């Protein structure tokens, strides 16, 4: 009964950090979609400037 107190605290400390992890997951998955959309845009502007149709 001195062990079950230790385990019973360790069990609650785990679920506390699952809750934090799950809130951060949402914010990170948002940032990864935004960054990937901007990468495709900046690649499009480069290829346009490389064709330079207005110089021809």
């Amino acid at each position: 009964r001195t062990m079950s107190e230790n385990l019973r605290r360790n069990l609650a400390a785990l679920e506390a950090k699952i809750s934090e992890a799950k809130t951060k997951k949402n914010m990170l998955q948002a940032r990864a979609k935004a960054a990937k959309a901007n990468a495709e845009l900046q690649q499009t502007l480069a290829a346009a400037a490389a064709a330079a149709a207005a110089a021809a």
């Binding site: 009964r1 699952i18 990170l28 990864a32």
Partner: protein
């Protein structure tokens, strides 16, 4: 040892080769799934020891 040093080189390349297969978007939610069911297993084992203190 020389073959320790070669081992740690070849082992580190293989571990890096895996690390860049991890897609941040897929693995980051699987990690939370795994960490949730770990708590389901743990709670069963704890309760099984509480039953015996009672007994």
């Amino acid at each position: 040892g020389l073959f320790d040093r070669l081992g740690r080189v070849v082992r580190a390349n293989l571990n890096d080769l895996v690390s860049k297969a991890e897609d941040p978007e897929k693995v980051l939610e699987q990690a939370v799934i795994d960490m949730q069911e770990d708590l389901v297993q743990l709670r069963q084992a704890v309760a099984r020891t509480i039953a015996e203190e009672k007994r």
